[PDB]
Design an enzyme around this catalytic site. Structure first.
Site, mmCIF file in Angstrom:
data_model
loop_
_atom_site.group_PDB
_atom_site.id
_atom_site.type_symbol
_atom_site.label_atom_id
_atom_site.label_comp_id
_atom_site.label_asym_id
_atom_site.label_seq_id
_atom_site.Cartn_x
_atom_site.Cartn_y
_atom_site.Cartn_z
ATOM 1 N N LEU A 15 0.838 -1.319 -0.013
ATOM 2 C CA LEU A 15 -0.014 0.056 -0.011
ATOM 3 C C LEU A 15 0.851 1.010 0.202
ATOM 4 O O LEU A 15 0.692 2.342 -0.597
ATOM 5 C CB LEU A 15 -0.941 0.112 1.364
ATOM 6 C CG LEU A 15 -1.923 -1.263 1.252
ATOM 7 C CD1 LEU A 15 -2.832 -1.311 2.627
ATOM 8 C CD2 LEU A 15 -3.094 -1.147 0.095
ATOM 9 N N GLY A 16 1.736 1.140 0.840
ATOM 10 C CA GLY A 16 2.891 2.344 0.932
ATOM 11 C C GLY A 16 3.889 2.067 1.519
ATOM 12 O O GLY A 16 4.470 1.149 2.206
ATOM 13 N N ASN A 19 9.824 6.778 5.660
ATOM 14 C CA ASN A 19 10.069 6.672 6.918
ATOM 15 C C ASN A 19 10.324 5.467 7.734
ATOM 16 O O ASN A 19 10.125 4.995 8.719
ATOM 17 C CB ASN A 19 9.277 7.546 7.848
ATOM 18 C CG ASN A 19 9.135 9.001 7.305
ATOM 19 O OD1 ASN A 19 10.235 9.893 7.286
ATOM 20 N ND2 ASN A 19 8.170 9.531 6.839
ATOM 21 N N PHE A 20 11.372 4.636 7.025
ATOM 22 C CA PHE A 20 11.734 3.224 7.410
ATOM 23 C C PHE A 20 10.610 2.250 7.355
ATOM 24 O O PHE A 20 10.891 1.181 7.908
ATOM 25 C CB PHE A 20 12.631 3.445 8.505
ATOM 26 C CG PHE A 20 13.938 4.262 8.407
ATOM 27 C CD1 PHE A 20 14.060 5.643 8.844
ATOM 28 C CD2 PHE A 20 14.981 3.525 7.777
ATOM 29 C CE1 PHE A 20 15.178 6.441 8.188
ATOM 30 C CE2 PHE A 20 16.162 3.904 7.423
ATOM 31 C CZ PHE A 20 16.337 5.647 7.783
ATOM 32 N N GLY A 21 9.429 2.668 6.972
ATOM 33 C CA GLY A 21 8.418 1.519 7.257
ATOM 34 C C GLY A 21 7.659 1.134 6.102
ATOM 35 O O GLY A 21 7.803 1.847 4.885
ATOM 36 N N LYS A 42 1.467 -2.283 9.313
ATOM 37 C CA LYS A 42 2.614 -1.511 9.172
ATOM 38 C C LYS A 42 3.920 -2.229 9.853
ATOM 39 O O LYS A 42 3.839 -3.063 10.948
ATOM 40 C CB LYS A 42 2.579 -0.276 9.546
ATOM 41 C CG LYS A 42 3.658 0.874 9.447
ATOM 42 C CD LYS A 42 4.343 0.908 10.690
ATOM 43 C CE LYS A 42 5.959 1.738 10.410
ATOM 44 N NZ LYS A 42 5.761 3.198 10.295
ATOM 45 N N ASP A 136 4.276 15.632 9.879
ATOM 46 C CA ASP A 136 4.384 15.121 8.517
ATOM 47 C C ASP A 136 2.877 15.449 7.930
ATOM 48 O O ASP A 136 2.643 14.374 7.223
ATOM 49 C CB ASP A 136 4.896 13.683 8.616
ATOM 50 C CG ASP A 136 5.407 13.288 7.161
ATOM 51 O OD1 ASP A 136 6.089 14.072 6.646
ATOM 52 O OD2 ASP A 136 5.240 12.087 6.945
HETATM 53 C C1 LIG Z 1 2.813 5.395 3.704
HETATM 54 C C2 LIG Z 1 1.592 5.788 4.679
HETATM 55 C C3 LIG Z 1 2.101 5.829 5.972
HETATM 56 C C4 LIG Z 1 1.405 7.105 4.110
HETATM 57 C C5 LIG Z 1 0.433 5.003 4.433
HETATM 58 N N1 LIG Z 1 -0.148 4.793 3.104
HETATM 59 C C6 LIG Z 1 -1.307 4.005 3.335
HETATM 60 C C7 LIG Z 1 -2.420 3.632 2.814
HETATM 61 C C8 LIG Z 1 -2.106 3.786 1.283
HETATM 62 C C9 LIG Z 1 -3.111 3.241 0.427
HETATM 63 C C10 LIG Z 1 -4.147 2.624 0.923
HETATM 64 F F1 LIG Z 1 -4.939 2.020 -0.039
HETATM 65 C C11 LIG Z 1 -4.312 2.477 2.346
HETATM 66 C C12 LIG Z 1 -3.512 3.045 3.123
HETATM 67 C C13 LIG Z 1 -3.552 2.774 4.770
HETATM 68 C C14 LIG Z 1 -4.545 2.069 5.178
HETATM 69 O O1 LIG Z 1 -5.691 1.674 4.666
HETATM 70 N N2 LIG Z 1 -4.827 2.001 6.358
HETATM 71 C C15 LIG Z 1 -3.547 2.325 7.350
HETATM 72 C C16 LIG Z 1 -2.818 3.159 6.686
HETATM 73 C C17 LIG Z 1 -2.447 3.203 5.528
HETATM 74 C C18 LIG Z 1 -1.619 3.861 4.785
HETATM 75 N N3 LIG Z 1 -0.440 4.445 5.295
#
Ligand SMILES: CC(C)(C)c1nc2c3ccc(F)cc3c3c(=O)[nH]ccc3c2[nH]1
Length: 281
Positions: A15-16, A19-21, A42, A136
């Site tokens: 998904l993404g 920051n090291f994660g 995460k 952020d």
């Molecule tokens: C990298 C970052 C911390 C910004 C992050 N991207 C996502 C994310 C990106 C696309 C998506 F479809 C869902 C998410 C998502 C999510 O669904 N839940 C919690 C965090 C998160 C997230 N947290």
């Protein structure tokens, strides 16, 4: 209930990251039949003691946040000890607000953008009430629950303010795109709820440009700039230059951005003051 078993978390996709994660889409599938609930999970990309400490802090912060405008904590899975391995969160398939705005721009009107602004503001009001500085805030770090509902995510850089101190100083300069940082963060590595207000002004800018890449904070600031880029950006801001009002931006919204971008943090409005004004518009 808030402890997830490793063997039951089934990897689906990325998904993404940052920051090291990394954040992965998993199915929590204890029955093994592909019928379980989807979750966003995460973890660190790789092991590291500094990053582990920061990760445990992120978990502790998010677990204690309870808001319709903050992404929901579900639980954790453990490594060896009490060492946290994964932070399990609700999955919001519409993804980040940056992506959502770009895709659906021709469908979302000014009232919708104002709704999102109000929701983000309310989440940030709440965060401030918990003495939490996000650090952020940007459209890429906000998620979409539905076309009428957004939630703040990305607590990996967040910090809690001690009871007797309303800011904190970081030792190293940051590693996020520089165009969201407040002047005092750029010059002295100072962060506060008031620097979050500055970033929120940039978020308002992003909303009202629908995160168009051609007039993005990076694209437009770089174009306006003309020493190191950070020193150049700092100079530009100290001279009083700001991002231009987005194309077709309502004047009232642009004025609020400018208030968010007051040179001195003590002169910026609070999220509590901004909320009613956004709701009025
Ligand atoms: C990298 C970052 C911390 C910004 C992050 N991207 C996502 C994310 C990106 C696309 C998506 F479809 C869902 C998410 C998502 C999510 O669904 N839940 C919690 C965090 C998160 C997230 N947290």
């Amino acid at each position: 209930p808030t402890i997830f078993e490793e063997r039951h978390l089934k990897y689906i996709s990325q998904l993404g990251k940052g920051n090291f994660g990394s954040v992965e889409l998993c199915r929590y599938d204890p029955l093994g039949d592909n019928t379980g609930a989807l979750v966003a999970v995460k973890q660190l990309q790789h092991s590291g003691p500094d990053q582990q400490r920061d990760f445990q802090r992120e978990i502790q912060i998010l677990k204690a946040l309870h808001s319709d405008f903050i992404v929901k904590y579900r639980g954790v899975s453990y490594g060896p000890g009490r060492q946290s391995l994964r932070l399990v969160m609700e999955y919001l398939p519409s993804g980040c607000l940056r992506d959502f705005l770009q895709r659906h721009r021709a469908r979302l009107d000014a009232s919708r953008l104002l709704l999102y602004s109000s929701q983000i503001c309310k989440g940030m009001e709440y965060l401030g009430s918990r003495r939490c500085v996000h650090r952020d805030l940007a459209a890429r770090n906000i998620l979409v629950e539905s076309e009428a509902h957004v939630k703040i995510a990305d607590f990996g850089l967040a910090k809690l303010l001690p009871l007797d101190k309303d800011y904190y100083v970081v030792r190293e300069p940051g590693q996020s795109p520089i165009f969201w940082y407040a002047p005092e963060s750029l010059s002295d590595n100072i962060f506060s709820r008031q620097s979050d207000v500055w970033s929120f002004g940039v978020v308002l800018y992003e909303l009202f440009t629908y995160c168009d890449k051609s007039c993005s904070p990076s694209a437009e600031f770089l174009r306006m700039m003309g020493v190191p880029a950070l020193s150049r950006l700092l100079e530009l801001l100290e001279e009083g230059q700001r991002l231009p009002a987005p194309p077709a931006c309502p004047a009232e919204v642009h004025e609020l951005m400018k208030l968010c971008w007051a040179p001195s943090p003590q002169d910026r409005p609070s999220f509590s003051a901004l909320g009613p004004q956004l709701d009025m518009l």
